[PDB]
Amino acid sequence: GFLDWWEDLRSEMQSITDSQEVFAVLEKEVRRLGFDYYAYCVRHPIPFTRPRIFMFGNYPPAWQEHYQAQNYFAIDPTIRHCLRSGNHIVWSDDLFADAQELWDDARDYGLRHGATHSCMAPNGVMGFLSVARSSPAISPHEREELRLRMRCLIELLHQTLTELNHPSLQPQPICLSKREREILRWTADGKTSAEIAKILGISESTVNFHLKNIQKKFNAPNKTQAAAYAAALGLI
Template sequence: MKPWQTDQLEKVLAASTPEESFARIAEEARTLGFEYCAHGLRMPLPITKPRTTYFSNYAPEWQQRYHEQGYMQIDPTIAHGMRSSNPVLWTDEFFAETPQLWQEARYYGLRHGWAQSRRDPEGTYSMLVLARSEQAITAAELEHTEPRMQWLVHTSHVSMKACCSDPELEQPKIELSDREIDVLRWTAEGKTSAEIADILNISERTVNFHVNSVVAKLGACNKTSAAVRAAMLGLIW
C-alpha cells in the first residue's frame, strides 16, 4: 500500500487546470477537518504588478465583501505570510488590530483558521489557509495533524504553480557567471562600481562590463533593477 503522502501527492499533482488543482486541495483539506480553504499564488515578476491567482471555497457573499472592503490590504494573515513562513493560528489577539474584518469573517463561518506561506527558490510565493466554522483548533490536534497540513502547503504550491504557469510568459532561464553574481551582490548592498572594484580587486571598467551584462540578461533598465530582479528570482543569495 502506498503511503498517504504519495497517494495524495499523485492525486493533487495530476490536476491539469488551476480549478481542478484547487478542488483536490479542498478535498484534502476536508479530510483534515476543514470545510473551508483558500490558496493564493504570486509569481515574482513583473515586480510592480506580479501575476497572481487566488481560489477559495468561502461563501460568495464573503468573497465579495472582502474584495469591496479592500480587506486584503489589512488582512493580518497575509501580512504574516509575507514576513514569515511559520504557520499561524487565528486568535482574537491575532486580529486585534482588524476587529471588523475578524467579526465579519466569523459571521460567514470563518471562526477557526490556520495558515502558512511558502516561497520557493525561484521567488514564487503562495499561502494556504485552512478554516472551519466549528470546533477550535487545539494543541493536541495540531500535534497530530499539522505535519499533514504543512505537507498540503507544499503540495498545493507545487501543483498550483505548475497549473498556473504560462510558457509564453515564463522568464527564460538565466545563467549568471560567478563574477556577475559577486557584482550583483555588492550592487544590492548599495555599493558603487568603484567600491565594488576595490572589494573584488578588479578594474572599475570590468565591474561596469559585468553590470551591463547582467542588465541585458535580466531585461532590466539599470543595475538597481537588475539586482532586485536577481534577488526575486533567487539568483543571488
C-alpha cells in the same frame, strides 16, 4: 495511518494533468480535515510596493467579493510576508488585532475558526494555505496533526502546480550570466564600479557595461532596483 494517507494523495496528485483537478483534490482533502472552505495564495516578492498576488479557493463568493471590495489583502495578516513559528498560525483575535475590520467581517460571513500554513520557495515566492469553518473551534488535541497535514498539502500543491507550469507560479523570468551575477553580488554588497573593477581585474568600463545589461534584463531605471529585485528573487 498517516503514511497511507500521504502515499495515496501523492499517487492521486501525480496522476493529475489539469490544474482544475488539483484544486478539486484539495477541496476534498480540506473537508477530510474537518473544514468547509480553503484558500490558496501565491505571493511573489516583487514589486515591493505592489507584489503580484494570485488567489484561489472556494470561500463563499459573497465573501470573495467583500474581501475584494474592502481591499483586505492589504491588511490580511494571514498572507503577510513575515516569519511565523512552524510556518503555521491558528486564527485568533490576537492575530487580527491590527486588522479588526477584517476579522469582524469574516466572522459575520461564518469564517470563525481556521488556520493558515505558509511555505517559501527559495525564489522569493511564498504560498499560503488557509482552512476555515463556522462552528467547532480547533481542538488543542488536533492542532499539531492539522499542522502536519496542512504542511504536506501545501507542499504537494505547490509542487504539482509548478510541474504543470501554472501561470501563478512562474516568477519573473530573468537569466543572468555568471559574470554579471558576480558583478551584481558585489554591487548589492555596496561596492562601486571602481572597486569591482579592481576585485575582478577588469576595466571599470566593463563593469558599467555589465551593470547596464543587468538593468535592461530587469527593466530597471537604476542598479538599486536590479540588486534589490535580484536579492528578492534569489538570483544573487
